[PDB]
Amino acid sequence: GARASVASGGELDKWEKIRLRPGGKKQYKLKHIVWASRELERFAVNPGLLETSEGCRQILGQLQPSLQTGSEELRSLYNTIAVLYCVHQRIDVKDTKEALDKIEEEQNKSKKKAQQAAADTGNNSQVSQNY
Numbered sequence: 001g002a003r004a005s006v007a008s009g010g011e012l013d014k015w016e017k018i019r020l021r022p023g024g025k026k027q028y029k030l031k032h033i034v035w036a037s038r039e040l041e042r043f044a045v046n047p048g049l050l051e052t053s054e055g056c057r058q059i060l061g062q063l064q065p066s067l068q069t070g071s072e073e074l075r076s077l078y079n080t081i082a083v084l085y086c087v088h089q090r091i092d093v094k095d096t097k098e099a100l101d102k103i104e105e106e107q108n109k110s111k112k113k114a115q116q117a118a119a120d121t122g123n124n125s126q127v128s129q130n131y
């Protein structure tokens with residue numbers, strides 16, 4: 001709309017800079033965004049959530065636990081939305097895969113810097129074990 005806060009020109013260059021495959025020659029294009037923004041509108045998810053890295057976290061996290069149940073359609077969104085996330089956090093990816101992996105290894109840092117926080121929230125639940 002008339003109120004943006006992402007880039008509008010800069011990020012665009014980077015977007016088309018990311019490759020669709022690890023060893024391919026294909027790259028990302030508007031077709032992917034527009035398509036994603038639309039689909040989201042149907043999944044009760046505003047297309048504006050992809051505007052801020054924070055928003056994506058909510059989207060990806062939702063389709064995350066669904067990447068198994070959902071069809072190939074849900075897998076297409078996650079892949080895309082996942083990439084943009086890296087760009088929004090100022091992360092230079094090499095390919096669609098590099099993005100997904102980054103989002104993972106990245107979060108790993110938090111765990112290392114939360115040895116006290118994690119210990120505070122945790123318990124040992126001993127389930128049953130009969131014959």
Ligand SMILES: *C(=O)CCCCCCCCCCCCC
Pocket residue numbers: 001002003004006032033036050051052080081084
């Ligand atoms: C009007 O105020 C909003 C128009 C500008 C928003 C575009 C920035 C976010 C790009 C959409 C998601 C990209 C998916 C890779």
